[PDB]
Amino acid sequence: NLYQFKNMIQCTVPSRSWADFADYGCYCGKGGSGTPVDDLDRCCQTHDNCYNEAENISGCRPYFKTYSYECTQGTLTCKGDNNACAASVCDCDRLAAICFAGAPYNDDNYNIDLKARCN
Amino acid sequence: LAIYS
């Protein structure tokens, strides 16, 4: 869940508050739809897709699902106890967080008009 | 309160 995703972001990208990613480009935070403004938006886009596939697993709700994971000494790990759904969700978030840590951050792309630059 | 991505 987004509390855990939050904590994931906070442990892979220390220097930057998680809020910085809650409203960026067309796919970070606010729904989406349209071409990702940039790499950091692409990370999120892939992340939105991951959630949609996960939604295919019945009784699987990407935002409220609580999975098992840990982050220590710079290592983000999805534990083995997770069922199919939790595992998927965990890995979605995990891949995203790692993606965030390697992508540039453009301030011009923070909180852009959604309605006019994304249908 | 709410949602990142």
CATH no. for residue A55? Answer: 1.20.90.10
For residue A2, give its domain range: 1-119
Angstroms from B3 CA to nearest CA on chain A:
6
Window B:1-5, CB contacts with A under 8 Å:
2-5
Query: At A41, which amino acid appears?
Result: D
Q: Please, which contacts does A83-91 make with residues 24 or more away whose CB atoms are closer than 8 Å?
A: A84/A57, A84/A60, A85/A54, A85/A57, A85/A59, A85/A60, A88/A50, A88/A53, A88/A54, A88/A57, A88/A60, A89/A1, A89/A51, A89/A54, A89/A60, A89/A62, A89/A65, A91/A50
- This entry's atomic model was obtained through X-ray
Cβ-defined contact of B4 to A48 (cutoff 8 Å): no
How many domains does chain A contain in total?
1
Report the alpha-carbon distance of residue A115 to residue B3 in Å, rounded: 18
Q: How far is CA B5 from CA A28, A32, A81, in A?
A: 5, 9, 25
Place of tokens 């480009």: A25
Q: This structure's resolution (angstroms)?
A: 2.6
A48 is in an annotated binding site: yes
Cβ-defined contact of B5 to A6 (cutoff 8 Å): no
Report the alpha-carbon distance of residue A97 to residue A119 in Å, rounded: 26
Q: In degrees rounded to 5, what are phi and psi of residue A101?
A: -65, -20
Structure tokens at A13: 């990208």
Show the 3-state SS of chain A: CHHHHHHHHHHHCCCCCHHHHCCECCCECCCCCCCCCCHHHHHHHHHHHHHHHHCCCCCCCCCCCCCCEEEECCEEEECCCCCHHHHHHHHHHHHHHHHHHHCCCCHHHECCCHHHHCC
Structure tokens at A87: 């595992």
How many residues does the structure list for chain B? 5
